[PDB]
Write a protein that binds this ligand. Structure first.
Ligand SMILES: *[C@@H]1O[C@H](CO)[C@@H](O[C@@H]2O[C@H](CO)[C@@H](O)[C@H](O)[C@H]2NC(C)=O)[C@H](O)[C@H]1NC(C)=O
Length: 277
């Protein structure tokens, strides 16, 4: 697999949508049982899971994003653990959807397993609220471990759900699949894929490329962290991007401010506060 040498370009992404999506996923770190909670322009419709065993998933309706699915990213397992452990092994796509993927696709076991525990509930709830809200757009959002799950979900929606995917917004995204997977993401949802990295965050560097993992094309890197200075680094694994500035192995920037919305996670803002910073 290659590494892009394209020079960085200005950030072209909608920063109001990023700010909104950041709040929608921060809220999944919070108790989300309140009827009709409003986050930004969006209304909370449904919540699944909790934090242990399975990631919390919130479903919203948004005038700008449509039916928005947001996936919590708590430490079900740790990404700073022994990399020989089975969590990090590459494996085939699950039988539910393997027929849609090109030969040779591989995914990280720990992330695929987490998505597989959620996918049938997500599909059932999304279809229900698309019908009830007369909404064709589906947006998938995730942070941290949840961003890798959300990337798999976004592909699953594009491949298997009638109407496909509208957009995906991914914060502090770990690597998820191999070279073949990464290029299939570009092919299927490249124009819909938004990966946002804050500051010195280390999570987008794991699992390592030495284990066969590869990011899809493009990310927007906020630097310095929590600022509004950001550029787009085109192509897969752009050599001019985050490794030019030493990563910090704590969660500070990872749980930082993304275009005025904090994703502080379990010790963040509950309820989430779109645009408050
Ligand atoms: C960006 O903002 C985040 C908060 O969203 C900062 O994270 C905090 O960092 C301090 C250490 O300086 C920790 O004690 C806090 O626990 C962190 N908060 C959270 C929610 O994790 C981060 O330091 C900021 N980064 C920069 C470069 O200013």
């Amino acid at each position: 697999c290659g590494s892009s040498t394209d020079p960085p370009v200005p950030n072209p992404y909608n920063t109001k949508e990023i700010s909104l999506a950041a709040g929608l996923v921060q809220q999944t770190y919070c108790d989300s049982t309140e009827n009709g909670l409003k986050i930004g322009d969006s209304e909370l419709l449904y919540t699944m899971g909790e934090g242990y065993a399975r990631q919390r998933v919130n479903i919203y309706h948004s005038p700008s994003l449509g039916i928005a699915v947001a996936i919590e990213g708590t430490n079900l397992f740790s990404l700073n653990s022994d990399l020989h452990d089975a969590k990090f092994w590459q494996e085939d796509p699950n039988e539910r959807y393997i027929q849609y993927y090109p030969k040779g696709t591989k995914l990280m076991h720990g992330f695929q397993q987490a998505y597989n525990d959620l996918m049938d509930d997500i599909f059932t709830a999304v279809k229900k609220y698309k019908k009830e809200k007369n909404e064709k757009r589906v947006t998938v959002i995730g942070h941290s471990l949840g961003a890798a799950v959300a990337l798999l979900c976004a592909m699953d929606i594009e491949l298997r759900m009638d109407g496909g995917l509208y957009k995906t917004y991914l914060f502090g995204l770990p690597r998820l699949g191999n070279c073949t997977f990464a290029s299939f993401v570009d092919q299927k949802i490249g124009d819909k894929f938004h990966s946002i990295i804050n500051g010195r965050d280390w999570v987008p560097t794991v699992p390592p490329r030495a284990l066969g993992y590869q990011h899809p094309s493009d990310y927007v890197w906020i630097y310095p962290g929590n600022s509004t200075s950001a550029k787009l680094y085109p192509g897969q694994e752009n050599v001019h991007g985050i490794l030019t500035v030493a990563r910090e192995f704590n969660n500070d920037d990872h749980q930082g401010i993304y275009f005025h919305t904090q994703i502080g996670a379990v010790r963040g803002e509950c309820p989430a506060q779109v645009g408050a910073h």
